[PDB]
């Protein structure tokens, strides 16, 4: 209990921390639930201890804007440290302060709406590959596991948009380029290893000296040379790698070759498990709400008659599609929490925040708060219609974060997912099976994933 | 050899580092000598590795000013980290960045020339106590160990100028207030413990979690309550404690009670072993250069006839006294090195310095460089006469450092030592004994102290 008396001093409420452990025994239900209960017992602001690390939760919308936007560069610039990360210290999502601001500048033009429009015909091709692999499992006439057919598509989109490799991953389950990227899995921070790091942060330097890394030494070594091969095989003869190779031919130093590999890995990590997981939560909400699934299939047939191919402009045209995606992200925000490290002794919105405190925003707990959402746990896509979309505080619904450090690929991800939904709904309908978990139970761990894999019926239109 | 390829890349020369150990095996001769040899083999700029920590030495005067003065706040603000320090993180000599700048502001008025003039009659009283204890060892007619009679005086000056306690330490060898302060000893950074920290910096966080501290848990606990007792016994009824208690009755927050204890300990640490050690090196240079000792005794008798008591104005009046003190500090600069941590990727005086590099200035090696000193190893106080004192680059001779982070007590220390020398030379002469080590050999460790304790003859005038 070295720093366990800080919140009691400031008068901030919170649960009682055990020595050394702090409040980590409360994670037995998961992040999403320890947050909802704390929002209940204590109100708009409270605190707790991840081991000896004090964490200050905030739920006031005006106070959130100061953290994420206003005092972002001056105060709350970096995320909660974690390791050992090895060379992935150069990834944008991990870099801090000034190294981060240089990386955010060198990679921001990579994610403009102009570059995204040139990636659309490439991503659309794997929508067609997604249909043929789903039509073979539809004539199978038995339940189809979503995260396998969506994982194959998300894998396909990543390998092509980031490196230019074009593989049918579902029909090439043993390709070298596919074998490595499947070993990249989302970090479970309530799992044994990362919990020990939370209680023993002093062990992080020991692991760094042993070259141990949370990113496996082999998948990283496979890409560190694949890039340097492609940087010397494409050279000389619209992928993320090309845009980064173009960037180092000009804040204010060019992207290094190892920094190039770091961002490529972070893009694969980001677009792989997120795209396939969100697409799973959407089809579960459509199969259990056939009214929604039918209405969306009709909007798709109006913009794209004769099962016409979707384009960049035809996708941004659909609004009920954007309503369904936003509503699913409300009930299942894959981030759950937003966090920033306080680097100074500052006073925001009338409250003293000392240096070293981790400020946290419980996104999951705010997405299901009745103070802003009518019938929160119900899947009602009408909240985001242009009639009611104005009653939504942009600092309560933050699926992609907010401020200068929000998700840099928010819009590649939306385009990637909407293109998949359109082609899938132009050829199939989705019914619930007997083994379909209803209602869906979230995993008690540190990931926003279903307890049991989603299984649905798939029929051909 | 994680970061052992940095200097080889930049083209900077330096000795070959072993894996993990780096260049630490070269410290078998000491700091002062590994520095002189490196100044020889490599020139004006070189580098080496304290374990995995790269250290860049610089010896160009214009490049030193940028580090210590110009880019001090922007780049080279903090010293080389070391621990575990516990609550002594709040000491000014240890605090970093903005916490340091706040502490330097709150304690700068404590060390003005105005406050020092009010401390003179107090310090002068223990000059008289120094004489009587030396006159009893003069009629003993046998060699007198200097660091025992000067340690008693330096102890006396510290307890009175910092807390107001007045003890004859040499005749009260068992006083509670004297027993604790004698347990404070200068850190030997070439000793087993601090060398292990250099090779295993990842062990510092482990020791911090076990409340282990390089400052003994007992001497610190004795002063942490002695202050809070005196802060409640003097309250309510010219010491360093009073000036700090006055400071917390006004950048820009008042001094905390624990921060008060931290600075008091750093003042005791500073003024104790330094004052007694420098006074030992001076009397050794006077006893082995009787021409100097006689000339100074005559200058003292001109300003202060009839063994008149020295005052603040009569001390600043003497110039040969100031010449002797400066020349002794040239041959024995107790700091040996000046160091700063580079916090940015900067380019100073036409050289790229990457982040995380420790910039080092070899003070001992520059004080004995023939490129600026004629006959460097000879004790010639005439270098600092107002005739030749202009041929001395203020960035080569830096016994008290330079820039915004120089020694805050440079001038309390000079006044403390000169007052002792005057009273001692007004009553005694110092002859060398048979056991007098001639020439004096410095210790092969990490401290600038004699191999054997200095022993001299003392006769009454
Ligand atoms: C449904 C899909 C996705 C969602 C919901 C999502 C959400 C988020 C959230 C909540 C953050 C943290 C924002 C904050 O801390 O304030 C974030 C950061 C980030 N995301 Fe995403 N993301 C998605 C997909 C992607 C994709 C496909 C990429 C591809 C490059 C990507 C790249 C990044 C990066 C680089 C960051 C860190 C930005 C920085 O630190 O400067 N994300 N995302
Ligand atoms: C012969 C006596 C002394 C000598 C030669 C000496 C020399 C030095 C040197 C070389 C430095 C480092 C400067 C740098 O890093 O640029 C320093 C720092 C310092 N000294 Fe002294 N010193 C002496 C006595 C004292 C005394 C009596 C005090 C009493 C308070 C004191 C207080 C300090 C402090 C607080 C610092 C750190 C300043 C900071 O980090 O802001 N020193 N000294
Ligand atoms: O720091 C923390 C908190 C540490 C902690 C917690 C509790 C206790 N003790 C310590 N967690 C994130 C840093 S690692 C993040 C992990 C990840 C998330 C989703 C999918 C794959 C991988 C990652 O690799 N992201 C790459 C890019 C990406 C991934 C997903 C969506 N968009 C973009 C912070 C973070 C969260 C979300 C998004 C980005 C970063
Ligand atoms: O950081 C370092 C380098 C660490 C390292 C080295 C090698 C390898 N790996 C790591 N060393 C100093 C920080 S501790 C200093 C120690 C000390 C010196 C003299 C007397 C008593 C105590 C201290 O307690 N000083 C208090 C005030 C004082 C003491 C003496 C003279 N004036 C003022 C830096 C420092 C040097 C000199 C002066 C101040 C600070």
From Swiss-Prot, chains A, B:
Impact noted for substituting residue 148 to H: In allele CYP3A4*10
GO MF: 1,8-cineole 2-exo-monooxygenase activity; 1-alpha,25-dihydroxyvitamin D3 23-hydroxylase activity; anandamide 11,12 epoxidase activity; anandamide 14,15 epoxidase activity; anandamide 8,9 epoxidase activity; caffeine oxidase activity; enzyme binding; estrogen 16-alpha-hydroxylase activity
Description of what induces expression: By drugs, such as rifampicin.
Effect of residue 144 to I: In allele CYP3A4*9
GO CC, any one term: cytoplasm
Enzyme class (EC, first level): oxidoreductase
GO biological process: aflatoxin metabolic process; alkaloid catabolic process; androgen metabolic process; cholesterol metabolic process; estrogen metabolic process; lipid hydroxylation; lipid metabolic process; long-chain fatty acid biosynthetic process
Assembly mode: Interacts with PGRMC1; the interaction requires PGRMC1 homodimerization.
Pathological condition linked to this protein in its record: Vitamin D-dependent rickets 3: An autosomal dominant disorder of vitamin D metabolism resulting in early-onset rickets, reduced serum levels of the vitamin D metabolites 25-hydroxyvitamin D and 1,25-dihydroxyvitamin D, and deficient responsiveness to parent and activated forms of vitamin D.
Designated name of the protein: Cytochrome P450 3A4
Gene: CYP3A4
């Amino acid at each position: 209990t070295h720093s366990h008396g800080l919140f009691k001093k400031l008068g901030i409420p919170g649960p009682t921390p055990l020595p050394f452990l702090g409040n980590i025994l409360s994670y037995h239900k998961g992040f999403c639930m320890f947050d909802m209960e704390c929002h209940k017992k204590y109100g708009k602001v409270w605190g707790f201890y991840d081991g000896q690390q004090p964490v200050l939760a905030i739920t006031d919308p005006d106070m959130i804007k100061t953290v994420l936007v206003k005092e972002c560069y001056s105060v709350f610039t970096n995320r909660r440290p974690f390791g050992p990360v090895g060379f992935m210290k150069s990834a944008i999502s991990i870099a801090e302060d000034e190294e981060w601001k240089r990386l955010r500048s060198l990679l921001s033009p990579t994610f403009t709406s102009g570059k995204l429009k040139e990636m659309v015909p490439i991503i659309a091709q794997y929508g067609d590959v997604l249909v043929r692999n789903l039509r073979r499992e539809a004539e199978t006439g038995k339940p189809v596991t979503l995260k396998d057919v969506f994982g194959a598509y998300s894998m396909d989109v990543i390998t092509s948009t980031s490196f230019g490799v074009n593989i049918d991953s579902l029909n090439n389950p043993q390709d070298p380029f596919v074998e490595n990227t499947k070993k990249l899995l989302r970090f479970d921070f309530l799992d044994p290893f990362f919990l020990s790091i939370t209680v023993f942060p002093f062990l992080i330097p020991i692991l760094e000296v042993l070259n141990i890394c949370v990113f496996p030494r082999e998948v990283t070594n496979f890409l560190r040379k694949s890039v340097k091969r492609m940087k010397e095989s494409r050279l000389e003869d619209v992928d993320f790698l090309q845009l980064m190779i173009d960037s180092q031919n000009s804040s204010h130093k060019a992207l290094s070759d190892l920094e190039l590999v770091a961002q490529s890995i972070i893009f694969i990590f980001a677009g792989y498990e997120t795209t396939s997981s969100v697409l799973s939560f959407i089809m579960y909400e459509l199969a259990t709400h056939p009214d929604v699934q039918q209405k969306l299939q009709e909007e798709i047939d109006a913009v794209l008659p004769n099962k016409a191919p979707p384009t960049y402009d035809t996708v941004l045209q659909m609004e009920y599609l954007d309503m369904v995606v936003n509503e699913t992200l409300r009930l299942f925000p894959i981030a759950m929490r937003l966090e920033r490290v306080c680097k100074k002794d500052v006073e925001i919105n009338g409250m003293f925040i000392p240096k070293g405190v981790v400020v946290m925003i419980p996104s999951y707990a705010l997405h299901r708060d009745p103070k802003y959402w009518t019938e929160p746990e119900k899947f009602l896509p009408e909240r985001f219609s242009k009639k009611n979309k104005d009653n939504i505080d942009p600092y309560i619904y933050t699926p992609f974060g907010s401020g200068p450090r929000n998700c840099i690929g928010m819009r590649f991800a939306l385009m990637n997912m909407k293109l998949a939904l359109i082609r899938v709904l132009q050829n199939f309908s989705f019914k619930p099976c007997k083994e379909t978990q209803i209602p869906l139970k979230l995993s008690l761990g540190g990931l926003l994933q279903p307890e049991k894999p989603v299984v649905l019926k798939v029929e051909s239109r």
